[PDB]
Amino acid sequence: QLHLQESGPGLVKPPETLSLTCSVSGASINDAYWSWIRQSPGKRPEWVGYVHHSGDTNYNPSLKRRVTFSLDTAKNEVSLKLVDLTAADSATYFCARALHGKRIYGIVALGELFTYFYMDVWGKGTAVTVSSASTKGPSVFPLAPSSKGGTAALGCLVKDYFPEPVTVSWNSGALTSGVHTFPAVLQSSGLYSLSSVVTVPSSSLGTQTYICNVNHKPSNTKVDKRVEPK
Amino acid sequence: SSMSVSPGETAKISCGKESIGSRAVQWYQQKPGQPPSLIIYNNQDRPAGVPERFSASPDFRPGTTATLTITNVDAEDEADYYCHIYDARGGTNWVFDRGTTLTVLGQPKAAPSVTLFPPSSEELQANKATLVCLISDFYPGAVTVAWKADSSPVKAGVETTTPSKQSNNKYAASSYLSLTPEQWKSHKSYSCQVTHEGSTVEKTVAPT
Ligand SMILES: [Zn+2]
Ligand SMILES: [Zn+2]
Ligand SMILES: [Zn+2]
Ligand SMILES: [Zn+2]
Ligand SMILES: [Zn+2]
Ligand SMILES: [Zn+2]
Ligand SMILES: [Zn+2]
Ligand SMILES: [Zn+2]
Ligand SMILES: [Zn+2]
Ligand SMILES: [Zn+2]
Ligand SMILES: [Zn+2]
Ligand SMILES: [Zn+2]
């Protein structure tokens, strides 16, 4: 009946530093080895380190200087602490229990063996974003359809905003069909960007109007833009 | 890395580079919206709970590759697979190595629809330029994306999103390219090239 649960701040503006906790239920923190792991979307899982109350502890060379773990008996809790943050520290953070074994391939007295770890119980992880930017509303540009399938495609480029989220609709929500609204990219600038598109009968571009409606709550901004053939 | 099979069949998966010293290898499975879970440790041993259709290769000698096998594949086997390698001679890895993204087919295959937009004159007055490549309705859910200028590779100044699931179980994605107005004018064309499963689609725009 072992069970783990992570907790963290969410967004962090970096002169500050990151502090995370993990609640353990069904065992005492002095009965095992504990691990932290991190993962960016689309990327491979990365191993941060491990702690034992004996003091057999080690950290990944990638970030060894800025990270430390500690143990609190009264709360039955594992903790992580990282300093000097940049935007590449953004990830999902997992905590786990590390079991250990020995691989023996010759004569023990000649040191023909080594120690390895494997992880058998994990938490659901906590999402952390690091950003040094200030709130900013979007600029909105038109993606015009061509005059030259029988169908045309048109839309809105929603550019340079912070932070997420943004809602987008068409003709005050009276056009729900043919619409693909895509999720955003993050530039080296620090702000986001996304786009929205509709495909339409090209035999109606002279009689019909299309207007996208953008709404960005964190800056109290609303925009309406009409998209036209060239 | 990408792979697809039909229910009832057998999957074989390689991972990492060839051995130098004696090995201890661990394998890990990860479904959509979940933390990794453990399926093999110490090269061939199986933790309790794990079905017997999963099995892996023992360590016998230098020069070989770690390999995982799933017999009688069920639909719930759809996942990402990772391995974690310890080698007496090569040292300890701190990042998991990749096996594959594994799809268990329930539908016909479908090629991507692609659309490509030049930068508006509104944007050009603001002293900026952007190309936008939108990709929709493909299955299974993996593609690669390459940008080309006249007939040369680009690489620098590109951002591309992960695939995401539409409400009819197909996938979509996006790519962007950043330009100075002077760069946009001093070439003859630009292309967006999308590869699904060894097949390629291409769109092209011009300043004129
Ligand atoms: Zn002790
Ligand atoms: Zn020991
Ligand atoms: Zn559609
Ligand atoms: Zn980038
Ligand atoms: Zn409105
Ligand atoms: Zn490797
Ligand atoms: Zn070879
Ligand atoms: Zn062995
Ligand atoms: Zn080693
Ligand atoms: Zn295809
Ligand atoms: Zn389209
Ligand atoms: Zn050039």
Residue numbers in the entry:
A (entry chain B): 1 to 82, 82A, 82B, 82C, 83 to 100, 100A, 100B, 100C, ...
B (entry chain A): 8 to 9, 11 to 67, 67A, 67B, 67C, 68 to 92, 96 to 98, 98A, ...
Paper quotes:
Two residues in the elongated conserved face 2 are critical for HIV-1 neutralization for all three antibodies: TyrH100B and GluH100I. The drastic effect of mutating either one of these two residues to alanine in PGT121, PGT122 and PGT123 is suggestive that this conserved portion of the paratope is the primary determinant for antigen contact, and, hence, for HIV-1 neutralization. We note that the PGT123 open face appears to play a more important role in mediating HIV-1 neutralization in these experiments, when compared to PGT121 and PGT122. The lack of high affinity binding to high-mannose sugars was further validated by the absence of any electron density corresponding to glycans upon co-crystallizing PGT123 Fab with Man9GlcNAc2 or by soaking PGT123 Fab crystals in a high concentration solution of Man9GlcNAc2 prior to X-ray diffraction experiments (data not shown). Alanine-mutagenesis experiments in the PGT121 paratope were performed to show that the residues that contact the complex glycan in the crystal structure are indeed responsible for binding complex sugars on the glycan array. These data indicate that PGT121 LysH53, which mediates two H-bonds to a galactose moiety of the biantennary complex glycan in the PGT121 crystal structure, confers complex glycan reactivity. In addition, PGT122 and PGT123 do not have a lysine at this position, but rather an Asp and a His, respectively, which might help to explain why these antibodies are not reactive with complex glycans on a glycan array. While sCD4 bound to the SOSIP.664 trimer with a Kd of 579 nM in the absence of PGT123 Fab, there was negligible binding in presence of PGT123 Fab. The reverse sequential binding experiment also revealed that PGT123 Fab was not able to bind SOSIP.664 trimer after pre-incubation with sCD4, despite binding the unliganded SOSIP.664 trimer with a Kd of 990 nM. Also noteworthy is the lower binding affinity of PGT123 Fab and sCD4 for the SOSIP.664 trimer, compared to the gp120 monomer.
